[PDB]
């Protein structure tokens, strides 16, 4: 049952201009609030922002922001708080605060892999990384094969745009790619 989901949200200008960050937040809120009670008591969440002007994380890497540390239990209170943190970030950065031309997706991915591996150690827990981005070509990464050996975390990529990422996906087991258009069912 137990599971760990780490969210990575791309906050590049195209993500921030086309409401993809907004949409991602809305979706995270729906999903987290919709967890079963049993589930909240066994699972973990965390959130990292990639391509981000804020640099704060365990490895003190540029342009990666661990906006939510590993969190359990995933209670309603905890969820509302997490979503508020994402909301502040948007409100505070909706007026374009120096995120042009940033590429830190691979560094973010590696920080997460290191944070995860430290976090969980020898625990029997499903580990997962969910990635919200509209650029599957921006993943500065043969290298893939090193991850394919190191990462025991499956990767769910969410393409928010109407390759390196594809390669990495097929490399790691149980990985997948979805459109935003197929996350929930629109009613018509």
């Amino acid at each position: 049952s137990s599971e760990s989901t780490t969210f990575i949200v791309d906050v590049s200008p195209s993500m921030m201009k086309n409401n993809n960050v907004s949409k991602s937040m809305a979706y995270l809120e729906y999903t987290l609030l919709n967890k079963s009670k049993k589930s909240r008591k066994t699972d973990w969440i965390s959130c990292y922002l990639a391509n981000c002007p804020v640099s704060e994380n365990s490895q003190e890497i540029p342009n990666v922001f661990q906006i939510q540390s590993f969190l359990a239990p995933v209670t309603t209170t905890a969820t509302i708080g997490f979503i508020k943190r994402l909301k502040q970030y948007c409100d505070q950065h909706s007026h374009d605060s120096s995120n042009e031309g940033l590429q830190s997706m691979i560094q973010c991915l590696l920080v997460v892999s290191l944070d995860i591996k430290q976090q969980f150690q020898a625990r029997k827990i499903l580990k997962q990384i969910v990635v919200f981005t509209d650029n599957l070509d921006d993943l500065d990464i043969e290298e893939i094969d090193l991850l394919t050996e190191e990462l025991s975390t499956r990767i769910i990529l969410i393409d928010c745009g109407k390759s390196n990422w594809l390669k990495l996906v097929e490399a790691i087991p149980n990985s997948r790619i979805y459109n935003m258009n197929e996350l929930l069912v629109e009613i018509t």
């Binding site: 490895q59 560094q107 590696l110 290191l114 591996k117 090193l146 190191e150």
Partner: peptide
């Protein structure tokens, strides 16, 4: 642990 860390220093 070690491989990941050098691979990240490589990227910084």
């Amino acid at each position: 642990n070690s491989k990941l860390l050098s691979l990240l220093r490589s990227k910084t």
